[PDB]
């Protein structure tokens, strides 16, 4: 499917055992993939780009209206994998309870904030040693194919810096900043937004479905 210039690309509401493989959402608005209580599903292949916010006229929706590539909600059991979420105002918004969901092989590029996990439980989005491309991921692929050594613990602030100022990655690859980060991933600073991909990805998957 192809949804362009909408106000919600895909509203997958209150359902079961569906397949949303191979779809494609273009410059939508306020939402890319809204999933409520969507269980036992095989979400794959989707592509969400530039989900603009609610900005028309002289107004600002303070602390609201932020676009979302994937609004995943209450959906305990899915098989989300091989999806490309790009140029959004947020991705993989995860509220309610979504434990036992299998997330892997996705691609999150150029997001203002890649994840907004809120639950007080720990959930690893890496099934069988496969994480997500995680553009914000800062460095470290020393083994040739070891997908990654640092687990992608999301920080909202660094995501904002790495999008507005894209050169900051260079600034944060200096050995001094590197050892500072080595000490900030050992003695926790900023309480752990729980999500943590033990095996993030350095290669960019979903290259087949970029432009088709």
């Amino acid at each position: 499917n192809v949804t362009r210039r909408t106000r919600t690309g895909y509203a997958l509401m209150q359902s079961r055992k569906l397949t949303v493989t191979g779809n494609r959402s273009e410059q939508d608005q306020n939402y890319g993939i809204l999933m409520n209580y969507i269980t036992y599903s095989t979400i794959t292949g989707n592509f969400v780009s530039d989900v603009q916010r609610g900005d028309t006229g002289g107004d600002s929706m303070i602390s609201g209206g932020e676009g979302k590539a994937l609004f995943i909600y209450n959906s305990l059991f899915n098989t989300i994998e091989n999806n490309h979420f790009e140029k959004s105002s947020l991705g993989i918004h995860l509220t309610a309870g979504s434990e036992d969901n299998r997330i892997s092989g996705n691609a999150f590029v150029g997001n203002q904030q890649q994840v907004k996990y809120v639950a007080s439980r720990t959930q690893e989005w890496s099934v069988d040693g496969r994480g997500n491309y995680w553009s914000d991921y800062l460095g470290w692929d020393r083994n040739n194919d070891g997908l990654g050594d640092i687990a992608y613990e999301p920080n909202d602030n660094v995501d904002r810096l790495l999008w507005l100022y894209p050169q900051v990655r260079l600034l944060m690859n200096s050995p001094s900043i590197e050892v500072l980060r080595w000490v900030q991933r050992a003695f926790p600073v900023i309480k752990s937004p729980g999500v943590q991909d033990s095996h993030p990805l350095m290669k960019l998957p979903t290259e087949k479905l970029l432009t088709e």
């Binding site: 900030q184 600073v189 900023i190």
Partner: peptide
């Protein structure tokens, strides 16, 4: 501690 974006704090362990 600005490597994580939290600019100023003085947690003694860090």
């Amino acid at each position: 501690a600005a490597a994580s974006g939290q600019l100023g704090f003085t947690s003694i362990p860090a």
